Ligand binder design. Structure first.
Ligand SMILES: [Mg+2]
Ligand SMILES: [Mg+2]
Ligand SMILES: [Mg+2]
Ligand SMILES: [Mg+2]
Ligand SMILES: [Mg+2]
Ligand SMILES: [Mg+2]
Ligand SMILES: [Mg+2]
Ligand SMILES: [Mg+2]
Ligand SMILES: [Mg+2]
Ligand SMILES: [Mg+2]
Ligand SMILES: [Mg+2]
Ligand SMILES: [Mg+2]
Ligand SMILES: [Mg+2]
Ligand SMILES: [Mg+2]
Ligand SMILES: [Mg+2]
Ligand SMILES: [Mg+2]
Ligand SMILES: [Mg+2]
Ligand SMILES: [Mg+2]
Ligand SMILES: [Mg+2]
Ligand SMILES: [Mg+2]
Ligand SMILES: [Mg+2]
Ligand SMILES: [Mg+2]
Ligand SMILES: [Mg+2]
Lengths: 67, 144, 60, 184
RNA sequence: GGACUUUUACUUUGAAAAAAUUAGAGUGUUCAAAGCAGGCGUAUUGCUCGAAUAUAUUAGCAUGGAAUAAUAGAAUAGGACG
RNA sequence: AGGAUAGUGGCCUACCAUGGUUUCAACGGGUAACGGGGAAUAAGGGUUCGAUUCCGGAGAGGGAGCCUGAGAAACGGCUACCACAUCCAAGGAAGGCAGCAGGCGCGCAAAUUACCCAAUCCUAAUUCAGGGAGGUAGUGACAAUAAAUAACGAUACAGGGCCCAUUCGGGUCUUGUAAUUGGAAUGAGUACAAUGUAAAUACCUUAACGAGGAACAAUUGGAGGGCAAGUCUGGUGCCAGCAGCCGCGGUAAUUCCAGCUCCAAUAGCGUAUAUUAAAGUUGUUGCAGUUAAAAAGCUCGUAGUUGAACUUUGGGCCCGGUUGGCC
């Protein structure tokens, strides 16, 4: 078998330079759990329709659903 | 001097002479006049789908006594009426009527094939089921 | 020419023929083996070299 | 969008399909060298046609032409390497005059047959396909391999196979297991 | 730097003609189609060859030749030399 | 001359003149026409194709206009008209898949409403976010590459020499044939694992399982000629049907329907259409023109094509290159 190998002078260098998927393969770091890609995209597009934070129209629709 | 000009500045003559004498050909003429796209019930296509209207007992040309079991077909894209030959023993009994058949040419570049006068196409499919397969009993025809 | 006729006789012979099922035979070799078989049947075996090296002659 | 992969076909069908002489010669070659296809012979004829076209294009030129010298010496070297052309024949005309059999004799199948180890070209083909040889100590399962005249000495059975050792084999193990359980 | 300076066609050489494709050199994709890789050591520290070349019309650019084929020159000498 | 433009310019305006293109094919029409790099086929010359991985151009349902900006006549940006068409508590509002998937139609004719930024690269205030660009897998016989479907013995037959040369006695060695039989070998296929990967799947490795035939069983076309391979059997009887062409078929079918055998290519084979070669049946290379198709009735003549010979040759002297050649 033939492959490629890297050996760093330290571990902080490795944790700053190596990729996260490889650190995860070696068990040093943890894969941050992420929502699926189109889910993130849908959320971003839902947020794009909001101007500001959302509290104003939140309480407004709370008020207006009684209307 | 064999007719044609040989001079070193006589190429235009040769070109335009070739153009005219190329029109004297058959394949060039059909290709450039666009007869396939303008005529030839297909659109210069390899195949064409059509709807059966009638079954026919076309009599063969001489010297040959036989009846050739063809069908009339209205093409879907053009609406043109076309006679097509159902090639095999007993395969007319899969083409009952109002079927949607696929037609191909026979192989003579638009001419009529043999003892069959006037037909230039053959049936390859009925309802998408391959007359060859139906005849060899590999598949069966749908209900409708 | 006459386009009509009588479409009743369609399938006459195909219907009349008595059906005869294939005899089950030992499977023939396939590929390099079949080429070996042919080479033997023709060149090292002269099986039928009557005058002209026929391949599928009639029994006589 | 991406750079396309290049591809070529390696064989050419002959113009006349049914020529009894050619058919006889082709089948004789197939029987002598253990082939399943006329495609193999077509492939060798294709390679040979390319080589001959190159040699003609060079021979039409002048000798001492740099292109002729370079490419002809390269072709000659590349053929002498696989032993298709003897070191007695290095003048670029025997290249044209070679044969199909000169190529076809260098296949690892018939080369195995020559170097013992198979006692038949069909046995050699199945041995190759069944992994029981190694050219260096590298395993090959292709008959069309074109030995380079320096691996010819290194052809041998494979270490990780029966006839090279370290394990008997599946059916032998089954037979020995049946024998051992019957011994009980 | 100047006085000037017959005009072309033709042909040689060169530059130019994207890359991929084409032909083609070298080379392990296990062969091959391909790819542009890879190979060699005491493999403990490393060393190193490459990724060529050719074709690419016609038009234009420069260049040598100057046959072949055209073109012009001094003739009521407002002709050349000085 | 002015205006306009980022700038040149009838780009536009005023005044003036009457020019400009054209049988060396203008202008107009057609194109089943985006152009090239290139592709197929090509002895050579050539013919055809080129929507399509690169370059350039154009367009964003059709037209037109315009804001912003360095840059757009922008359309995943506005404005209007046309045509399509969506939601309405009918007052009004919102639209542009020739981006990725996907769906109706159109049709002979073309894939998943999937995963990911790990790679290639791009944008941004920027190592960090985003990217249906792009890659990854799925469907996929478009095309291509390599290449399994069996191999070897021992017995029973049929050969060809050599030892005995003692009738026909043995046969050593051989190339094929078997309701013979043996043990070997193997991968397709399952699969702990590991590798692979962004993560998987596959590939390459690899424990264990996984050939003996009624199994892990290769088709596609054909057998009159062209054109490889039947005068074999049964059926029909100018009928059914085959047949690219010639032809077969009318009660003894080598051509139809089948069986057997055989042949060709073979995980590929056939059919249709188009195109290339064959085609020196487009003819520059390279056709033909008395009779086979074709010399205009005859002469003159303008775009063109073609056009007699002649002008520095001959002789010498040197220099140094490439091949050779004893050595
Ligand atoms: Mg001339
Ligand atoms: Mg006739
Ligand atoms: Mg010039
Ligand atoms: Mg002005
Ligand atoms: Mg003006
Ligand atoms: Mg168009
Ligand atoms: Mg189009
Ligand atoms: Mg645009
Ligand atoms: Mg649309
Ligand atoms: Mg717009
Ligand atoms: Mg859009
Ligand atoms: Mg789409
Ligand atoms: Mg068959
Ligand atoms: Mg048949
Ligand atoms: Mg024959
Ligand atoms: Mg026939
Ligand atoms: Mg038959
Ligand atoms: Mg030719
Ligand atoms: Mg002729
Ligand atoms: Mg006459
Ligand atoms: Mg005549
Ligand atoms: Mg006359
Ligand atoms: Mg002249």
């Amino acid at each position: 078998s033939v492959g490629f190998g890297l050996v760093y002078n330290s571990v902080a260098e490795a944790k700053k330079f190596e990729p996260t998927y490889r650190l995860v393969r070696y068990g040093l770091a943890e894969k941050v759990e992420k929502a699926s890609r189109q889910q993130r995209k849908q959320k971003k597009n839902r947020d794009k329709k909001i101007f500001g934070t959302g509290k104003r129209l939140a309480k407004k629709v709370a008020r207006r659903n009684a209307d | 001097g064999k007719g044609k000009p040989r001079g070193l500045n006589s190429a235009r003559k040769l070109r335009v002479h070739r153009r005219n004498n190329r029109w004297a050909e058959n394949n060039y003429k059909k290709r450039l006049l666009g007869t396939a796209f303008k005529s030839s019930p297909f659109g210069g296509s390899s195949h064409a789908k059509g709807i059966v209207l009638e079954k026919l007992g076309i009599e063969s040309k001489q010297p040959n006594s036989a009846i050739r079991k063809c069908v009339r077909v209205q093409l879907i894209k053009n609406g043109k009426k076309v006679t097509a030959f159902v090639p095999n023993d007993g395969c007319l009994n899969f083409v009952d009527e109002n079927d949607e058949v696929l037609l191909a040419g026979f192989g003579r570049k638009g001419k009529a094939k043999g003892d069959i006068p006037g037909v230039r196409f053959k049936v390859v499919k009925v309802s998408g089921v391959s007359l060859l397969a139906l005849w060899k009993e590999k598949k069966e025809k749908p209900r409708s | 020419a006459k386009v009509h006729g009588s479409l009743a006789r369609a399938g006459k012979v195909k219907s009349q023929t008595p059906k005869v099922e294939k005899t089950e035979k030992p499977k023939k070799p396939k590929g390099r083996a079949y080429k070996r078989l042919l080479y033997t049947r023709r060149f090292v075996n002269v099986t039928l070299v009557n005058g002209k090296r026929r391949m599928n002659p009639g029994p006589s | 969008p991406r750079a396309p992969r290049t591809y070529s076909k390696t064989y050419s069908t002959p113009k006349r399909p049914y020529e009894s002489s050619r058919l006889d010669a082709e089948l004789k070659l197939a029987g002598e060298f253990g082939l399943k296809n006329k495609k193999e012979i077509y492939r060798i004829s294709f390679q040979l046609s390319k080589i001959r076209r190159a040699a003609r294009d060079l021979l039409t030129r002048d000798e001492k032409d740099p292109k002729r010298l370079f490419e002809g010496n390269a072709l000659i070297r590349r053929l002498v390497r696989v032993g298709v052309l003897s070191e007695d024949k290095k003048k670029l005309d025997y290249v044209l005059a070679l044969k199909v059999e000169d190529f076809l004799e260098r296949r690892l199948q018939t080369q195995v047959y020559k170097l013992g180890l198979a006692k038949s070209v069909h046995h050699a083909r199945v041995l190759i396909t069944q992994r029981h040889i190694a050219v260096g100590k590298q395993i090959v399962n292709i008959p069309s391999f074109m030995v380079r005249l320096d691996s010819e000495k290194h052809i041998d059975f494979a270490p990780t196979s029966p006839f090279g050792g370290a394990r008997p084999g599946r059916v032998a193990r089954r037979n020995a297991a049946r024998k051992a359980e019957a011994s009980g």
